[PDB]
Amino acid sequence: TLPPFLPCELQPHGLVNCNWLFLKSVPHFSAAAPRDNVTSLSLLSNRIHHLHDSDFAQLSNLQKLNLKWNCPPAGLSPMHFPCHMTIEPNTFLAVPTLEELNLSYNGITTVPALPSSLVSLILSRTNILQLDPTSLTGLHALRFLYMDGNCYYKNPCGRALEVAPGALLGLGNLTHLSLKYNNLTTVPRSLPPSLEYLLLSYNHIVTLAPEDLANLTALRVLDVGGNCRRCDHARNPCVECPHKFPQLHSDTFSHLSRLEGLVLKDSSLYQLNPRWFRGLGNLTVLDLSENFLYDCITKTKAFQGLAQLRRLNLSFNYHKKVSFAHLTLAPSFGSLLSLQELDMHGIFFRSLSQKTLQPLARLPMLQRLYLQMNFINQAQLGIFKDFPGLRYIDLSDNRISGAVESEDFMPSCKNLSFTLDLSRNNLVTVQPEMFAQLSRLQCLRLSHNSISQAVNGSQFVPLTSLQVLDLSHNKLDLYHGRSFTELPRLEALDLSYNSQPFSMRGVGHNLSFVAQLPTLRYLSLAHNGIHSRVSQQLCSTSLWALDFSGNSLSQMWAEGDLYLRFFQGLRSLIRLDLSQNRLHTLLPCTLGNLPKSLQLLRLRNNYLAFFNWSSLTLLPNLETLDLAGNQLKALSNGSLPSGTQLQRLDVSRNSIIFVVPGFFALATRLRELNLSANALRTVEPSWFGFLAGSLEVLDVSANPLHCACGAAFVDFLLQVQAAVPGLPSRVKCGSPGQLQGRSIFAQDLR
DNA sequence: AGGCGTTTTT
């Protein structure tokens, strides 16, 4: 029988998802559907312009309703089409259980009547230009009001949004208010004392005083950034902050003892008034980005009081048209004993020395340090030795060049104890000297440099704890036999996109160093265009995973018997990616020379038009096989052979016209199968023997199915619907006539 | 007339 909520899709935790179905009105759903197991209803980005009383009446246990992007104002319409949305006055009253509503990106000019149950209301990017107490009548349970972007460059109005004095006082539970991008010039008078988060960024509130935040002693977060902007850093349309502005009175934040988060970004500040931070001893996050505090951070004592502060953002506090030769942080940074995260990216300074970060050197909790995009050309990396609790340094996108004068295939550094990112720098060789005091390092990123060195075993000698080394997007010449052997703990090495040496026609290269890395588990030689004149075998007893994608095994395996055993010496290998290797053909003899230990084999985006399925028995441990993106015209020439351990099979984006009967039958372990984007005109239960019920995923979307009245496929997909993703909307007909390009349920086939 | 379309959400 049918999916219960056609054309929408029943998802977990009682969600009915009608997203992106181009609906003109809300679907009703027959009484046969369990409309009370329905706890949430999503109608994102349809084209419903008219909302009725009956539309939600029958969904009597509905808690969440998303109606976003259905009727976008002209400025947000991708083609500037106007749209007004009519709501019948009992539309939402008929859902007395409603808790969260999203009416954002919809042309409405007044708030509709809403049930008292409502805990959350989002009215952002609407055309509502006024809020007064009649707007939000009887919403005493309401805790969240979000109404950003009702008057700005993308949704203009010609005036300020008008929140009348005391308009929201009726809302006794209101903790979260947001009114960003509304062209406000003053804070709204008399907001509920219950407010905990108040967000007024990207308005034009140029003056503040303690009157402007009267009675808001519950505030835990206050965002007032972007009201007086520096447009030299603006990516969007921007009005430059007037001269003699902004004016923030000293004691503006004095009565906010509970304040945890203060955002003052992009406020054109040349000087921090320390009186701003008096009485803010409970402050944990302070954002001062995109201001002009480049001098003030070498001098100020305004941080002295902030004992509990954890995150400090000083990024893009850069002087117009200049980078500094030197930057020395203030002594008062040394009293931030709680500090975990410091962002100094985009200040622009040329030198990083002991003096630069001296005050931070004895802070016990300092873990993450962002110094990227600073045009730094000299860096004494040895300063980080004495930092007690450091876990992460981002020094990427700098001009440092030396010492001073898919998680299956490559693991991330996220859970390691000490990571240095030096990517997007100007190293052309690696000097041991620059790492002299970094023997604690577990992860080093040096990608997107200009390293064009024949590494030999002498470059990374100090790094005796290093487990991950990323050298992707460089020009390494792999030639000497002992490259990387100075790293006793190396488990993951990325040498991808170092293609240029391998392009050098008539000059060969040496991969025999892989045998000399006894602890290595992960290796990417991906996107190197390896095609000729290389070692005939990779040899390693430790290696579990090898990305060899983006090379030309094609040309290698065409070259007599030289490279037929290339991957055979990888005795423990469990994952191999041979994708985009230009393979037009495979011998069964080539596949059997891959390691017996293999569990995962990718051959994506090759040019294979034929695959001898019987040779899968030569890889007895194979659980996953990816042939996506090849040119198979059929699943045939044998079946999946007996006793095969295969669980995941992807033959998507081929040109498969048919499947032989009983093709999958002997693959009893098969759980996930992707037949998407092929030329299948039908889906038969006879492909699966009659053991298809074990399948957890069967993707048959984007296939030119023959939707002839009474077709055998229709019935089959309903018997295994739990396993077919997107069945209600995305499995479509290629024929006949007017059904082409429309869902299989666009007319009843039975 | 309405169309357009996967466009952070906080």
Next chain:
DNA sequence: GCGCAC
């Protein structure tokens, strides 16, 4: 197949 060395 990239200063080794009948």
